[PDB]
Amino acid sequence: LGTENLYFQSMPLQLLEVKARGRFGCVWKAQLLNEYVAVKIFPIQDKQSWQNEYEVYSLPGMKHENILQFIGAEKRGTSVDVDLWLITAFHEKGSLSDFLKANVVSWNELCHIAETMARGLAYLHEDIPGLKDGHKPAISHRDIKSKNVLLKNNLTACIADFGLALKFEAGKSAGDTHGQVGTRRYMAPEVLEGAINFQRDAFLRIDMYAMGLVLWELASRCTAADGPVDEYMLPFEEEIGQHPSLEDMQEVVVHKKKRPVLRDYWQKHAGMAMLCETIEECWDHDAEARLSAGCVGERITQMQRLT
């Protein structure tokens, strides 16, 4: 019906349909040449996030099976009417959040999602000298959550949305976060308490806490439970609902030291029991006690091996 195209790097593109996301941005499913892609469009007010994600994707070694594939970024329009675009791969199965809303997962489905997710995050967090494009720094994501995990057609996970991500150079202290913070629900207690001047290992432990919560989401919709699988709920939603204040979260996580419920009947299955243990270690109130992404990946391999 439409013979008119937009153009990106001289290639024709058509917009198909939109989905909302953070900072009043949006993401379109689009067709670039003969493939579907995702075109993220940021208002000029969220230029910082656009620039940050572009910079992150421009770091050495940022191409990985478990990292949402970057296609390109540009400023579009006039001096006065500016749009910011960042294009990535499109995944028809969407985010793990939307997936879990509509589907339960078998034990083997759960392990594959967990393992590929942990791999992506372990790789993000890893400092790697010696790449052809340079030295990859450790990178903290800073907004880990099921909505920022996308699923490929075989349920392979990839980590998405680097608008808040922060690199660390062995040379210096942690750089400018520009006052931007993550999704309240998934914030570690020390973030909720307003502890400041975090350094590398602290940012990584913040991601691992949020990752614990995502692993809980998987567990909560897994058929390996020896019992019913309830309808999907977000972490802490049972306790503080779908739209909590910072004060709601502080009360529930810092003050009451509470976490999403790990049911005993989830632990008959030997794998699940081990999953539950891993979750508990990831979301420990003590950041220093939390498991690294690499260690979590190993744990997931073990659960599988035993089953």
Ligand SMILES: N#CCC1C=CC(=Nc2nc(Nc3cc(C4CC4)[nH]n3)c3ccccc3n2)C=C1
């Ligand atoms: N960045 C980031 C997080 C995000 C933002 C919006 C989002 N919505 C969404 N995303 C997708 N898929 C998708 C989104 C992206 C890209 C991360 C914007 N790549 N693929 C679908 C696919 C099919 C039905 C519904 C979908 N909804 C899914 C994840």
